[PDB]
């Protein structure tokens, strides 16, 4: 009987090198009938995936929903990271009020 | 108030200027209708987001939020509508429609709900 929670370690902040693939993991306990979205928290924020669907650029963003041992890990992959991919990424659960976890990506050029 | 409206509308990111209303005033307890125009003769998906908290409201053909007052529908060939079935003062603020088109269009709409 608990509401959805985001479990450690989720949305870890990272420094990556240009061209790496970068994963953001959102581990959700007690998701129930709620749903998960990934967002780039720029201004304006950009939707990356909602539920089990990648919103755009399937060659740039990948989603692996409900994986891990407990089938509760949501993994967003950013392919081939560039300087434009720097910034904050969020995992959102559609509770009310929303439940969020955010991590920051830095990208260094050789 | 001016700062708030401008900070909302400055978030538009488009190659084609928004052809719809981008400032909507309604009275609390009435419905609100926010419009998103998409490119014609193509099957684009859109998503509506509430900027105050970042809540995703609708995505593609379906409501995402569990707040039951929100629905998305197709008003005509190229116009989608975010329908708020009963507006309250606390719904005032900035809303974004993102389109999955090649230019990754974002349209911004400022909603003001006035006291009944
Ligand atoms: C990333 O986030 C840092 C912490 O900021 C807070 O969370 C973000 C997502 C915003 O909602 C912001 O208003 C909050 O203060 C920021 O200090 C940092 O500048 C952000 N980095 C970039 C590139 O935006
Ligand atoms: Na964080």
Swiss-Prot record, chain B:
<comment type="function">
    <text>Together with zig-5, required postembryonically to maintain the position of ASI and ASH head neuron cell bodies and ventral nerve cord axons of PVQ, PVP and HSN neurons by preventing their displacement that could occur during body growth and movement. May act by reducing L1CAM-like protein sax-7 (long isoform) adhesion.</text>
</comment>
<feature type="disulfide bond">
    <location>
        <begin position="36"/>
        <end position="97"/>
    </location>
</feature>
<protein>
    <recommendedName>
        <fullName>Zwei Ig domain protein zig-8</fullName>
    </recommendedName>
</protein>
<feature type="glycosylation site" description="N-linked (GlcNAc...) asparagine">
    <location>
        <position position="61"/>
    </location>
</feature>
<feature type="domain" description="Ig-like C2-type 1">
    <location>
        <begin position="19"/>
        <end position="107"/>
    </location>
</feature>
């Amino acid at each position: 009987g608990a509401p959805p929670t985001i479990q450690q370690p989720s949305m870890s902040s990272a420094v990556a090198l240009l061209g790496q693939d970068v994963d953001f993991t959102c581990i959700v306990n007690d998701l129930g009938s709620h749903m998960v979205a990934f967002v780039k928290a720029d201004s304006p924020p950009r939707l990356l995936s909602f539920d089990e669907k990648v919103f755009r650029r399937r060659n740039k963003y990948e989603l692996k929903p409900r994986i891990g041992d407990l089938h509760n890990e949501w993994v967003l992959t950013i392919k081939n990271v560039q300087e434009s991919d720097r910034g904050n990424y969020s995992c959102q659960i559609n509770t009310e009020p929303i439940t969020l976890s955010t991590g920051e990506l830095d990208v260094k050029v050789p | 108030a001016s700062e708030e409206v401008m900070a909302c509308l400055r978030q538009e990111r488009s190659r084609v200027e928004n052809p719809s209303q981008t400032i909507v005033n309604v009275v609390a307890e009435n419905p609100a209708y926010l419009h998103c125009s998409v490119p014609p003769d193509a099957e684009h998906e859109i998503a509506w987001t509430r900027v105050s908290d970042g809540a995703l409201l609708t995505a593609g053909n379906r409501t995402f939020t569990r707040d039951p007052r929100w629905q998305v529908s197709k008003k005509s060939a190229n116009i989608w509508v975010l329908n708020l079935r009963r507006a309250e003062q606390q719904d005032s603020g900035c809303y974004l429609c993102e389109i999955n088109d090649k230019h990754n269009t974002v349209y911004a709409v400022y909603l003001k709900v006035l006291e009944p």
